[PDB]
Coordinates of C-alpha atoms in Angstrom, one line a residue:
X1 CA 105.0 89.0 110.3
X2 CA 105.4 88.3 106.4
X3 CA 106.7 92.2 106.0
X4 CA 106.3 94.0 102.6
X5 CA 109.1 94.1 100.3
X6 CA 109.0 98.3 101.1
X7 CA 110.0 96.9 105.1
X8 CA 113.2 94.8 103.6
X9 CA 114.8 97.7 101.8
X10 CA 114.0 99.8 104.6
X11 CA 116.1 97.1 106.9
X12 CA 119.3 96.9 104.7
X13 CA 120.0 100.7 104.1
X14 CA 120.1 101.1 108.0
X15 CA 122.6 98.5 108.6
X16 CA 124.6 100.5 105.4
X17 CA 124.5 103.4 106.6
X18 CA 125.8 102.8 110.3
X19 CA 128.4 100.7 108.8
X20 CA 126.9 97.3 110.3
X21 CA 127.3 95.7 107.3
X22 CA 128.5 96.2 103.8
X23 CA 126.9 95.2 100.2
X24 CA 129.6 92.7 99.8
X25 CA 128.7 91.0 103.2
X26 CA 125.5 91.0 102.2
X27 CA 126.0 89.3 99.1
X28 CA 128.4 87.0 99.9
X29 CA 125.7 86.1 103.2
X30 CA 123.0 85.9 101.1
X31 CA 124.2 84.1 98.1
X32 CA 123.0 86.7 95.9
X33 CA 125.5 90.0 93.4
X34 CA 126.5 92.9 95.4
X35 CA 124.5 94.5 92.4
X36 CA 121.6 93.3 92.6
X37 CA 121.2 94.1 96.6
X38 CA 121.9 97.8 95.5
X39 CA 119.0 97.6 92.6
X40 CA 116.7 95.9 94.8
X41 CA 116.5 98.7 97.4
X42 CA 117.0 101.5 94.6
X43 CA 113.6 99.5 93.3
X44 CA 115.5 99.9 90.0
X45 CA 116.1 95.8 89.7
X46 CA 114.5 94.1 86.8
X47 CA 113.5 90.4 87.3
X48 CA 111.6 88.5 90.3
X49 CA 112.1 90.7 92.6
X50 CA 110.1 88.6 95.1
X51 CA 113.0 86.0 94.7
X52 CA 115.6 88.1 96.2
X53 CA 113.0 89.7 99.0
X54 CA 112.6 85.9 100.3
X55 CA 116.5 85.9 100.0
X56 CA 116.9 88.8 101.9
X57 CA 114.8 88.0 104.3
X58 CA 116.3 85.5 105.6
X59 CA 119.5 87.3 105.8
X60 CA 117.7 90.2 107.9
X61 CA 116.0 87.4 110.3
X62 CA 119.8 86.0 111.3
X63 CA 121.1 89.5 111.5
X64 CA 118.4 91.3 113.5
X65 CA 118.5 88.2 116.1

């Protein structure tokens, strides 16, 4: 199920907030800046966002299996 971009921001501040991962690990797992994860779920980041939601969903596939 291709989920919205709403759905993969929803994911990550789960996994944050139970302490299942961290915005480093995240980065460093997905390739992308530790700031840019943050912006991306604040829906504050400026650029293609539908870049980093195909990024990060692949992160959230290997995680969540």
């Amino acid at each position: 199920g291709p989920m919205n971009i709403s759905d993969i921001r929803a994911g990550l501040r789960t996994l944050v907030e139970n302490e299942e991962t961290t915005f480093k690990q995240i980065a460093l797992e997905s390739g992308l800046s530790t700031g840019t994860i943050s912006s991306f779920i604040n829906d504050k980041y400026n650029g293609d966002n539908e870049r980093v939601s195909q990024t990060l969903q692949r992160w959230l596939e290997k995680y969540h299996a």
